[PDB]
Design a protein around this ligand. Structure first.
Ligand code: R7J
Ligand code: R7J
Lengths: 136, 136
């Protein structure tokens, strides 16, 4: 569907990388947080939902169902939380020393994941795909 | 054009709100930063450019032309920096006490600006407009 998203954790240099995937397109948004609190998760969902149609967020774990802020962010924004890739880390390792902060390398790797052509040569990007789907 | 953006400062509770406007659509993205450094500006541009087509960023002032990080972010991302609205603050004042941090109210106000129908009743939203333009 157009507004389906998958939310995930990944970890690096002892920080948490939050990743949202638009399932139909492959487009990603990521943010690095100091700590894995639900407060930070809730602000990232709020930003996401103001930038895109965010109807349903899937999570693999239980941590998102026990944060009152997240619950209140989803209600205000109209997000359905429901229970039930890592080329990213390859690219972060490529750029990691051409900028100091990990967060920057993450966002450089998000840039590349979203903009490249899905697989190399020919097709659309994750970022083209998401706009198309939503246009319809 | 599709990738034209306007970048602006606004201020509230003694913090800086960075605002990017997609000129053709009216869509906005905003971030609150501790300090007005170019480092923070450069990370916000990097995130923006990984989420959307960002070809040209207009600024009203000179502060962006004197930050080496911003200059290096634009070059890496392919952004042309060139030299040459505030319903936002109205909405931040409406929500400001239904959440603690200013940043949240900003993002709630961004959500509303982007999602509402441009003027009330009938039309498209800023957020629909931007996707349409880019689809084409
Ligand atoms: O490096 C850091 O941690 C500081 C920093 C904060 O926001 C940024 C956005 C972009 C770049 C950058 C620098 C050089 C080449 C390049 F392609 C990108 C750096 C930063
Ligand atoms: O409040 C704060 O500063 C903490 C906070 C950080 O990220 C957030 C994202 C969303 C909400 C929230 C809370 C209640 C109603 C609502 F519509 C939204 C709060 C926060």
């Amino acid at each position: 569907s157009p507004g389906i998203w998958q939310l995930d954790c990944t970890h690096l240099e002892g920080k948490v990388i939050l990743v949202a995937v638009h399932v139909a397109s492959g487009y990603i948004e990521a943010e690095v947080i100091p700590a894995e609190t639900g407060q930070e998760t809730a602000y990232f969902l709020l930003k996401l939902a103001g930038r895109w149609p965010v109807k349903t967020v899937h999570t693999d774990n239980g941590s998102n169902f026990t944060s009152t802020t997240v619950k209140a962010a989803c209600e205000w924004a109209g997000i359905k939380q429901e229970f039930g890739n890592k080329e990213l880390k390859k690219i972060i390792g490529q750029v990691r020393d051409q900028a100091e902060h990990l967060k920057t390398a993450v966002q450089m790797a998000v840039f590349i994941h979203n903009k490249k052509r899905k697989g190399g040569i020919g097709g659309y990007s994750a970022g083209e795909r998401i706009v198309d789907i939503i246009a319809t």
